[PDB]
């Protein structure tokens, strides 16, 4: 296998804007195909990148600041990823950027069915516009951006269409977090790659049943290789101070599980949708698909020494020591370019608790599945499919609670579109009997959220035989949105469901 350690961590550039005025920031990207190295000991890998670069620029806003994004396709009229056919004449490369995290009026959100072909010669059901607007009256806060198009996401998004986007809100400068060269972004995405250098992904599910299409599409995905802003198990030379880090999970599937080899302390600062109330100290932290930690590692104690940034949690099996148990590597070798004036605050925000809103609707949700004619799962939101009509129908300005009910093995990363959300509490049930009667019967008490989830989350871990409540405020615009599960082989076949907020 490849070896650790040999590729210094690539920063992306910051995007700089087509036109700038006070009132508005204009923003060209295009996707096309591209090779870059992966690895050292690599030939170059064939990609699909936004400005021919994996990840692609972040994108770096102010709060209110008005910024249009045109999106535009020169990507091939042929893919290179394997399409299943029978899980949606149509062009066979469809695109939709996505603002993970937006607070976006519906017609620039990226809706699955708004994709576009090349030069938008095709345009899906729901396409609007070319230009996307993005007004960012919203907090501060790690996002970023990807392709969302129908029954294409886990391969757009597989063959690189990934960035960062931050939001930066003056009023947290006074903070002192860490900034500037001293913030940086990590998105994490396992690949698997050939000697050659080329992308590899499933075909077909391993020892497939003769009664399955080819291509077909697989219920997870698990790369043999993990990359840091696109490089393969890199590492990056700090120097002995605190860092920001916006932590962000771009993989199609796997959860990492993340500590420092040295026993070194995270400070999490924020979650999704900002920074949190409180500061807290960790050893380790969960990280599904989508979700993203906003932290300072303090490097002011360990100069001279390297250390990993190490994973615990497998995919579709233990971590292997040599592969998939490691990330990255910090080397504490740099010199100090100035004295460290940054800070690591306790008291970071207001507390969502503050708030008292009135809950309109409760709402029960199970995620489910069946099996299709050629014996695959399909897995469900509510045992509807995306194509059934629309069931999710918050109002506009109303709270709701929902109920998630999971039973099935695993944890699934639902993630609602425009809004953040507060997590209420876990609570463990009786598996068997809630799938002989739809009886809910609970086998402990509720479990509050711990600290990292008492702030704003968008993308949340429904673990196995629990129920998850969260409480969102639908909100500030109405219209036709999503909600899913995040793992991209899920959400296209076809963990995903319509959302309107009506007015
Ligand atoms: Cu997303
Ligand atoms: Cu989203
Ligand atoms: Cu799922
Ligand atoms: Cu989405």
């Known amino acids: ?266 400070i999490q600062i924020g979650s999704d949708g900002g920074l949190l109330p409180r500061s807290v100290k960790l050893n380790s932290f969960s990280l599904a698909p989508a979700e993203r930690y906003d932290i300072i590692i303090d490097f002011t104690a360990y100069e001279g020494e390297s250390i990993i940034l190490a994973n615990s949690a497998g995919c579709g099996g233990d971590v292997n020591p040599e592969t998939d148990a490691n990330i990255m590597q910090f080397r504490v070798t740099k010199p100090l370019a100035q004295k460290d004036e940054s800070r690591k605050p306790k008291y970071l925000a207001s507390y969502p608790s503050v708030q008292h809103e009135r809950i309109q609707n409760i709402r029960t949700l199970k995620l489910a599945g069946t099996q299709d004619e050629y014996g695959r799962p399909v897995l469900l939101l509510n045992n509807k499919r995306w194509h059934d009509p629309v069931t999710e129908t918050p109002k506009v300005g109303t709270t709701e609670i929902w109920s998630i009910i999971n039973p099935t093995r695993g944890t699934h990363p639902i993630h609602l579109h425009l809004v953040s959300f507060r997590v209420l509490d876990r609570r463990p049930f009786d598996i068997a009997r809630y799938q002989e009667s739809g009886e809910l019967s609970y086998t402990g008490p509720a479990v509050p959220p711990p600290p990292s989830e008492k702030g704003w989350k968008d993308t949340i871990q429904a673990h196995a035989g629990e129920v998850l409540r969260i409480a969102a405020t639908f909100g500030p615009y109405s219209g036709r949105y999503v909600w899913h599960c995040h793992i991209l082989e899920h959400e296209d076949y076809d963990m995903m469901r319509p959302m309107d907020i009506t007015d």
Not at 182 to 198: C, M, Q
Request: charged share 25%; net charge negative.
């Open 1 to 266: 296998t490849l070896e650790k350690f040999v590729d210094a961590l690539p920063i992306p550039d910051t995007l700089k804007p087509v036109q700038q005025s006070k009132e508005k920031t204009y923003y060209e990207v295009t996707m096309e195909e591209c090779t870059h190295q992966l690895h050292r000991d690599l030939p170059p890998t064939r990609l699909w990148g936004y400005n021919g670069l994996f990840p692609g620029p972040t994108i770096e806003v102010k709060r209110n600041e008005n910024v249009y994004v045109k999106w535009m396709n020169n990507l091939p009229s042929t893919h290179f990823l394997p399409i299943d056919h029978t899980i949606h004449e149509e062009p066979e490369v469809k695109t939709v950027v996505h603002l993970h995290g937006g607070v976006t009026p519906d017609d620039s959100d990226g809706y699955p069915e708004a994709w576009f072909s090349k030069d938008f010669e095709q345009t899906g059901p729901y396409f609007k516009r070319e230009v996307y607007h993005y007004p960012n009256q919203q907090r501060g806060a790690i996002l970023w951006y990807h392709d969302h198009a129908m029954a294409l996401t886990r391969l757009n998004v597989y063959a690189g269409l990934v960035g960062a986007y931050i939001i930066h809100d003056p009023k947290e400068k006074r903070l002192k977090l860490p900034s500037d060269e001293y913030d940086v972004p990590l998105l994490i995405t396992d690949r698997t790659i050939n000697e050659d250098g080329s992308l590899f992904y499933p075909s077909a599910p391993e020892n497939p049943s003769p009664s399955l299409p080819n291509p077909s599409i697989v219920p997870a995905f698990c790369g043999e290789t993990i990359l840091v802003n696109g490089k393969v198990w890199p590492y990056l030379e700090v120097e002995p101070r605190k860092y920001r880090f916006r932590v962000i999970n771009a993989s199609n599937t796997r959860t990492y599980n993340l500590s420092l080899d040295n026993g070194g302390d995270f």
